[PDB]
């Protein structure tokens, strides 16, 4: 019997699903490790959970992630949420709950985004203007 956990992260329209498995802790996105992805200025983001919790917590859990939708930044924020969420879901099911709780606490005090997904989503444009809230310029005279 194998220890499989498939957990998702979201940001606007970026469904990043991280999939944890009893392994040796590779952690690769689509088909490549966390040292590319390639917005790159936001590398420490997709690293953050690993940096917070350390390699010791991950150690025995290999995580293959798949992403689609969103744009570059949104995808990073999705995977970052997802791999952390997946790790928490692994520890819930196939370790012990006090350990999970400790991980969850360590993540949240850094940032609540790591588990909780933003509801914020693109607002709809309405006629009489180029965007949602902005209007087209008034002539008057």
């Amino acid at each position: 019997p194998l220890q499989s956990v498939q957990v998702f992260g979201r940001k606007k329209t970026a469904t990043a699903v991280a999939h944890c498995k009893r392994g040796n802790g590779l952690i690769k996105v689509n088909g490549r490790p966390l040292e590319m992805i390639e917005p790159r200025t936001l590398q420490y983001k997709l690293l953050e959970p690993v940096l917070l919790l350390g390699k010791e917590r991950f150690a025995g859990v290999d995580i293959r992630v798949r992403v689609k939708g969103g744009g570059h930044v949104a995808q990073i924020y999705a995977i970052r949420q997802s791999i952390s969420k997946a790790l928490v879901a692994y520890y819930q099911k196939y370790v012990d709950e006090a350990s999970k709780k400790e991980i969850k606490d360590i993540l949240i005090q850094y940032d609540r985004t790591l588990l909780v997904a933003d509801p914020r989503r693109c607002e709809s444009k309405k006629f009489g203007g180029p965007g949602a809230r902005a209007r087209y310029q008034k002539s008057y005279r």
């Binding site: 088909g31 490549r32 490790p33 040292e35 590319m36 390639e38």
Partner: protein
Amino acid sequence: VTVKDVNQQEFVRALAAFLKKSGKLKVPEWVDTVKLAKHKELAPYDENWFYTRAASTARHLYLRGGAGVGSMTKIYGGRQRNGVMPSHFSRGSKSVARRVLQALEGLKMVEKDQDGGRKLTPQGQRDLDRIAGQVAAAKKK
């Protein structure tokens, strides 16, 4: 180690050098004179560009197969300054993509697949994934 394990930028540099050293591609007559797409104000500053984009096509083919000429134009697309009007998409040059794909065909990097469009072949998988390994074993950086 595969090609996805390598930072794709410094990969295509190494593949281009590989394709120069081989010296059996089939760079056509134009190269010097041509624009490269209706996008562009200018032609490429790197005077042996054909080798570079040939490499880029090959690596694209490894990552995603079944890529026809039209598909190769779409990937090499961008902004088109209408100048005083606003910008739009424009597909890259067909003929250059087609010449690149025919050049790779002669090398036996690639082969035209069933159900249309190019895919790279085992003998091509050789070179691509060999140079990946070379880049990985360049230095720890």
